[PDB]
C-alpha cells in the first residue's frame, strides 16, 4: 500500500530500504528524495554517530561498493528525506541548524590562528630563556 498514489503492490524501490511509505512509480529522483552518504550527512547536517542508529525510531542504511576503492570496503547510503526529518527533530527548527554551523566554521578558523600563535610562544621561549639567564 503506497502512501502517495494508493496503489496496491508487492514491493518497490523504497519501503524495503528506508521504510518510506511510497511506491516505486513516483520515483522523483530530483523531486522527492535522493541517496546521501553517511559521511555527507554526518559532516553536512551535523549529525553525530548516535543519531542515525539510536534516536527512536532508528533509520537504516544501504551498503554498496566504494566507488574509487573497489576492493577495500563499503559505502553507506542514507535517505535525504530521512535525514532532514531527523535533523529537524534533533536540532530544533531549520534555522537552528545553520546558526550552530556558524560557530563551528569559525572554530576551525579559531584553531588555525592559535596553532600559529602557540608556536610563537613555544619557539621564542627557548631563545628568550638563554638571554634571561646570567
Amino acid at each position: 500500500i503506497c502512501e502517495e498514489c494508493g496503489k496496491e503492490f508487492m514491493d518497490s524501490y523504497l519501503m524495503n530500504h528506508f521504510d518510506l511509505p511510497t511506491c516505486d512509480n513516483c520515483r522523483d529522483a530530483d523531486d522527492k528524495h535522493k541517496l546521501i552518504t553517511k559521511t555527507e550527512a554526518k559532516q553536512e547536517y551535523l549529525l553525530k554517530d548516535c543519531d542515525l542508529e539510536k534516536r527512536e525510531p532508528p533509520l537504516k542504511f544501504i551498503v554498496k561498493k566504494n566507488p574509487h576503492h573497489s576492493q577495500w570496503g563499503d559505502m553507506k547510503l542514507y535517505l535525504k528525506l530521512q535525514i532532514v526529518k531527523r535533523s529537524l527533530e534533533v536540532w530544533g527548527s531549520q534555522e537552528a541548524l545553520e546558526e550552530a554551523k556558524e560557530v563551528r566554521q569559525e572554530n576551525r578558523e579559531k584553531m588555525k590562528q592559535k596553532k600559529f600563535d602557540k608556536k610563537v610562544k613555544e619557539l621564542r621561549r627557548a631563545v628568550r630563556s638563554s638571554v634571561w639567564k646570567r
Binding site: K60, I62, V63, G73, D74
Partner: protein
Amino acid sequence: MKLNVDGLLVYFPYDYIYPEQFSYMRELKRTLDAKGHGVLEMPSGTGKTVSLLALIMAYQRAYPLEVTKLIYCSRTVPEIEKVIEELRKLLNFYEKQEGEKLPFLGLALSSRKNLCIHPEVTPLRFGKDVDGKCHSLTASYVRAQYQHDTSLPHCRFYEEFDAHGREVPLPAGIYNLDDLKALGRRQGWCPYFLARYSILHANVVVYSYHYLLDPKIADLVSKELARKAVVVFDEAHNIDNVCIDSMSVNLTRRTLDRCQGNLETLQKTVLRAEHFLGFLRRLLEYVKWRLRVQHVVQESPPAFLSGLAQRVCIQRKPLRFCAERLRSLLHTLEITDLADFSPLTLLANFATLVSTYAKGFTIIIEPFDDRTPTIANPILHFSCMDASLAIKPVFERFQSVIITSGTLSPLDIYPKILDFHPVTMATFTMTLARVCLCPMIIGRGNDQVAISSKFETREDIAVIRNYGNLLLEMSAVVPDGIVAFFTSYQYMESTVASWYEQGILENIQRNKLLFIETQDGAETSVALEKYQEACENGRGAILLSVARGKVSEGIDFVHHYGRAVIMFGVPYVYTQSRILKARLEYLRDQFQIRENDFLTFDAMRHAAQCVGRAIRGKTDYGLMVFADKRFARGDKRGKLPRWIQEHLTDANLNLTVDEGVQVAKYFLRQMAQPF
C-alpha cells in the same frame, strides 16, 4: 538429585551442578513452552550434553503431547556414540532412582558402512562402494528371482529382516551403533534397516546433520517421523557451510569426460528411453561447450537456462525430471552397481538444480586456473549463496529447533543468514574456581615491529623472525605441548623453511620436538601419535598445523596436550576467490551484511573453535595466545565469545613478545598448585 527448574522436576544424574548450568536448563525450557526456536551459546562439550538431555527427556514426561521425540543432530560418528553413552548414564540413574523399567528407546543412525554384518561387503573402505554392493544384493530385481528362493546371490540378513522385524519393535535399552550390530548379530537381522524402521517410533534419535538438512536425503528417512519434535543442532558453528555444500555441485573436465563413458555403456544396453539418451547427449555437449571457452570468469544463474534452449533447444520442464528418470532408467535396466554411474548422477543432480533453484544461486565458470596465467584447466561451480535454503523445511516442519555450540561469536548473525526468528538467543559463560584460561594478544615484536600476517607483511624478515622469536620463547616456559595453528600450508612451508635457514629452528628443537601436520592422513596420524607420546614422557612437543585443517576440528586437546595454543595470524579464507566474491555480493544486497563484517565473523569462529579446543573439563587449564596485531581491534576481539572474552583484559591486549612470556610464566606457575 531432584532439581526443580521453574515448573519442572528435572532428575539430574549428578550431585553438584554449576550455577550457570541451571540457567541453561532454565533458558531451554523457555523455548519449549513457547514452541519456538533458540540460539544458545554454551562453552563445554560435556555437561552441556548431559544438561540438555536431563531437561528434554524430563520434559516429555510432564507434557507428553507437546513434545514426543527428541532429534539430536551431532557432527559425526564419534560424537554420535558419545551422546548415547551420556544417555544410558541418565537412564540407568533413572533405573536406580525409580526401580522400574520404561517404554523408552533411543537409537543412533549412520551409514551402511557403520551398520554392516555381511562379510563380503563389510571391509569395503570407500563409502560409495558399500552402497553399491549392498544394492547389488538388496535391489528389488535381485529379490525378484528370490521369490523362487534359489542359490542366486542375495543378503541373508535383509531377507530375514522383513519377515520378522515388523511385528515386534525394539522394547527398551538405548542402543549404540555397536549395540545395534550386536542385536542384529544374535537375532540375524540387518542393523541398518532395523534402525531406519524403528526411527519412527523412538524418543531420542541421534544422527548426523545430513539426514535432516540434506534435501535429497531428508525426504527419504526423516519424512514422516514427527510433526511435534525437538531438533538440537549440537556443535553448530558451520551450519552455513553445511547448507551451502549440500546444495552446491562442482563440474570439471574430468567429470564430464567420464559421463561420455556412462552414456557409452548405456548405448550398449538399450540394444540388448532412447529419447532420454539423446536428451543427455544434448546436455553433455552444451556444458562441454560452456567449458570449451578460455575467457573471463562469468556468472549467469537463470541465463544459463536461456542459452541452454538456444543452441540445444532443451527447456526446463523436462529438465526438472532429469534426475528422476535417470533413477528410473537404472531400475529398469537392472544394473549391478550404481557407483560407476556417479558422474552421470552428478550431471543429473546438476540438471535438476538449475531448473528449480534459481533465486540466490550462481554458475561461476573459471577457465583461468588459480595462480597460473595460462594452464588449460577449466571448472564451473554451481555455488549456492543463501544458507537459508536448506533449513526452510527444517525451520517449518518441526516444532522447536535449537542451534547450540560453544563459540557462536555474534549471536545476531545466525538469525540474519538463516531466515528465522528465535525467541531467546542467549549466551552463557562457564564458572571457574580459578582463572582456567589466560588469553593474550601478543601484538608487536620485541623490537617494536608489527607482527600481523597481512598479504604485504609476509615476505619481510622482520616478521618471520618475530614469529620464530615467539615460538622459541614460549617453548621454554610452557610444559608439555604447544599447538601452533598457521593460516595456510604455503605459509607454514615458507616460514618453517625460513626459520631453518636462520638460527631459529635449531634452538626450538633443543626445547621441544616439532611435528608438522601434513595434508595426507598417513603421515598426520603418525605425527599425531608421536605428539601425544612426547607430551607424556619428558620432552614435550610442538604440533604446528593449519587452522582450516583436519586436526583443528576433530582432535580435542585435553589437559597436558596443548597447554598453549598459538594462533599465527587471523585465519582468513582466501578473500579473492570468485565464489566468495559472489556470495558477499549476495550478503550485501540481501540481509545488508557488510562485506568486511562477514570475513571477520568467519575468521573469529575458526580462531575461537581451535583455541577453545584446549580446555575440556574441570581441572583443565590452558594458555591461549593470539599472535597477530589485528586481533586487538574492536571488530575482531569483540567477536570471539563471552567465555574467552571476559578474561582478555586491557593489559593483555598489545603485549610484546618478551612481555607475553612473563604473563604466561606467571600463569602456568599459578595453575600448577593445588586448590
